[PDB]
Amino acid sequence: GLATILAISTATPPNCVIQADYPDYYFKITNSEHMTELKEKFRRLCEKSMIRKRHMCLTEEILKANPNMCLHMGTSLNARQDISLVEVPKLGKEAATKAIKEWGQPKSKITHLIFCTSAGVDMPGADYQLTRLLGLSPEVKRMMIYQQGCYAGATVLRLAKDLTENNKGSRVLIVCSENTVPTFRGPSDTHIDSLVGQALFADGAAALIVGADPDASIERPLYHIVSASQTLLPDSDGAIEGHIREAGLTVHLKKDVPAFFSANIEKSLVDAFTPIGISDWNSIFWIAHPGGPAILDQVEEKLGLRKDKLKASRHVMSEFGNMSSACVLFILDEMRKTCLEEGKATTGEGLDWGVLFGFGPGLTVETVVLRSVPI
């Protein structure tokens, strides 16, 4: 049978910042209060984000203890690594424990682990740290997916599908854990694209249990992963770049990232849904990585999506911000929850078929086709 999502959970650091308060706090903590023009430029970014609040392990106290993180280009990788390398598997464990509990099985039945993060690399990696913190079997088969950015929430589903379907009895724990430690920095007039990231990026972790052939007596399916594709967008080279440097992770954008994704999205829909015989994009349910808001506005107008097709996706953005790879898994969690609260006929807002989109560097589009589960 098909790879099936058997449990979903999430976790965020307790520290929460209201987006309406952030331009003032950010410019205060980075000693930029005199940059009056820049501050109001940042305020519009935050207000245009449609983010309400964001969770951040980074506190005023931590930043005062690591002041080079407050400069735009301070030598600070070591300080960022020291923080994030511990936080990433810590927040990951918080989500994993909840997913394993929903699943209701002993964690000794987990045969595989996919860990995914762009928040800091180490040897051994976060996969090893999670294995040890959780007490998973030492023989757990681990895949460590490092630094793939905001499309990796779909990448982990693509990987899980092949892992679980090719190994009878396999049960895969997926954990995405992301934070702003490597990217947080002070503002600068000549790096507006970095400023965009300070308005959008947030912390979060999501965890999944995936397996083929559920045991209906003990396990409850939420979605089936039917297919998973990945493509690079023509002429998009260099549109989004993230560099790991002495000053941490530096983000570099070209002008028209939304135009690339909207102009190419239907190709991915066609390629994925032609084998299912589906051509009407309002007849499927949608999960789309929301961390670039103009991407979703332009996709929805280009395709003529009904205005609420993307409500779940934009709601996670509103409540949590751009948590990179974790976002689409947060959105799956909410969608199945909302559908149960409202009595919908399926976990896919009453519809049988859905698409999950990951967007990120390379310009890459990950396209996962999902099948809902009844009531």
Add this chain to the structure above:
Amino acid sequence: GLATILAISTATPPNCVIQADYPDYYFKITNSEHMTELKEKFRRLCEKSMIRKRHMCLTEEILKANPNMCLHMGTSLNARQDISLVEVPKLGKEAATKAIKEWGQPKSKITHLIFCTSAGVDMPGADYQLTRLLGLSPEVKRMMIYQQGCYAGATVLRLAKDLTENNKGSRVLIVCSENTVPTFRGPSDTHIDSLVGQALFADGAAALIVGADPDASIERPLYHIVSASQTLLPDSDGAIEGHIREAGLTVHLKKDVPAFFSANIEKSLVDAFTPIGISDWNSIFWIAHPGGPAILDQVEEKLGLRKDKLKASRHVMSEFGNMSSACVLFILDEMRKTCLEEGKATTGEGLDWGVLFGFGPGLTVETVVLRSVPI
């Protein structure tokens, strides 16, 4: 059927260093000739390695231009990234083109790409650069395996097995590309395990084509991937660590590393070969990551292997040094070539079943069971 290796090729930078001359060259280029006692330690390490020569893209001219790389802990990550991020897909492409040529089929038939390196992280990754450099289909399904260290040569086979067996007609291009740019540094009194890296680490790339159900009329199997396990070793936490710092990749290694691997390897063999009905470890052909020579010596002694069992593994170490993930793939390439030329009965030294071992951080052992192909 089983995932099957259908082509293998390798590449190294043209610059080559003779190990007999390396203690003098290294302590001269690092302006450290006065550290006479440390130099004698380094001579002993270089000789005991049994390495004859290593390929390194790092020339003295590049080191002169990048002097903070010759300090022990100079701020140098940006300079290392600038070199390595270009070098990794460039060497990888040299190997990939050869492997695709051996395979003989159009590169438009490559459906998946696995890239593996510990030589530097970037967004988008080396998988992206290679895709563009080779002109693979923009729809190629990529997996980027970053910073998994010396066991990752086995990891990529474990991954490719599930990708190819779960997708009829899929053809995976695998590329490992490793170099010394992140780890090269000058010597220090207080950090002698970093000297071990300077005596051992080297540059190299290997590429393979892998798929299931080969077309006998146009493809030629070399090995079949029977199974692939991964385990952490008991009580070994912290014995090997690698940190990505402002000074580059720092290595931290405990003296007991070979004792951990040799004391635990027979459990990996029993677990992997009990399904096959095999208990005689001299009865199978061996590919073992050789970058830690004492590991192989103690494994050999512990299990009572004939001295010829590890000959092919030690030969690649002799001629190329520790190329991290690429080593085991070089060893596979050489083993099928020797068997072809010596008229052996199979590509696995005339034997039917074999084992491929990756060793690295976590203490992790990757165990891949192989089946050879007849003449």
